[PDB]
Symmetry: C2
Subunit: 229 residues, 2 copies
């Protein structure tokens, strides 16, 4: 599909960058020319992913530490302040950080795990969004992408807090898209089943959508949720 | 529609029972024969609502204190124990408690208010549901009703935490309906704008009555608008 320089001169921040889909997305964005900013809780994990992208790409991403389970609104503003000293805008923010929590009936759901899933997937993702909006408004056409799931649109047995949180994520995305008509592109990606493990798709397999949402080919698309597979 | 003894011998718990829609739902259910249990955060207000329902109906609801803003899972479990001492089952639970929070752009939403809205409307509403499930399963046909909103189906500018929380509520309702198919009726009610060209709580009662009475027995997993 996309040309190899699709994301030249796009600065894109990726949360949950240290492993899984986040790690693939950061690497993929860099491969396609982006200046990537990695966000995660583990500095040694982040440094390792940055080194790999540099070896593979020749340019080394910066990383910043944030723990969504515990971060405050103050921590997010300070993170945004640190970014802004190094970077003039954010062209993209990919919210790929998340907690799955318990997969079990509602009667069995652990209430602290429930609280933790809502804190990471909803509340912290919101506070981080709020902190980063000014930088995103500095883009020619900033793009904000949340991670959803099939159970964010149709609740199913056993999916408890994760489902509740992904519904909330669809709602948050919709409110934002309505507030930022013209000004920001705000959408969700549903990556689907990525991780019978040999039957599933690899993060690499689902990347085209992640690329599309950050490149110019999706320029006036907002308020939608997209299925990666 | 419906007969005046619709809810005779139905035991129905109403949260947020001490004002607005909750207070009207409690009263309506009592008028229609139900044994009502009121839940709220403030004793003085609940007692006043109970007394008024007794005056108007002739039977006095019991009340229990729970503050969804600060309650723990243990608090909900203890509440459920206290209810079980006094009652053999719950035929209905109406989750009417809620916090609206800020109505303003996402960039201006107060993060503390945001967290409080999610804690009341989602976390504590789930924790309370969890504690009351055994009682509801003891009904012949227990009915669990959440409160939603038009902005729990389509997000709109300025509705911030409320919207996120009501999407979460539609999601929680859908998971529960899937888990309890054939065992519990689990649905949402969107009361619409209420409280001069707006409707009163009294005006929107038909749906609240319908979901607790036998006419809705086969209906689960759905979200209903009180004002179509």
């Amino acid at each position: 599909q996309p040309k190899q320089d699709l994301l030249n001169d796009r600065i894109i921040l990726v949360t949950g960058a240290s492993d899984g889909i986040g790690r693939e997305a950061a690497m993929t964005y860099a491969r396609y020319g982006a200046t990537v900013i990695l966000l995660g809780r583990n500095e040694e994990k982040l440094r390792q992913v940055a080194s790999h992208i540099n070896e593979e790409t020749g340019r080394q991403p910066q990383w910043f530490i944030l723990d969504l389970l515990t971060c405050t609104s103050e921590d997010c503003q300070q993170l945004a302040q640190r970014i802004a000293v190094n970077y003039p805008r954010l062209d993209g923010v990919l919210h790929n950080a998340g907690l799955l929590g318990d997969v079990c009936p509602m009667s069995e759901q652990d209430p602290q795990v429930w609280q933790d899933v809502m804190q990471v997937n909803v509340n912290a993702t919101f506070m981080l969004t709020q902190a980063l909006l000014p930088l995103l408004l500095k883009s020619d056409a900033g793009s904000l992408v949340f991670t959803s799931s099939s159970v964010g649109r149709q609740g199913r047995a056993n999916w408890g807090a994760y489902a509740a949180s992904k519904f909330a994520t669809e709602g948050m995305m919709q409110v934002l898209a309505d507030e930022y008509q013209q000004r920001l592109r705000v959408n969700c990606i549903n990556p689907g089943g990525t991780r019978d493990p040999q039957k599933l798709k690899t993060p690499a397999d689902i990347m085209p959508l992640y690329l599309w949402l950050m490149g110019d080919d999706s320029r006036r698309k907002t308020g939608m949720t997209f299925d990666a597979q």
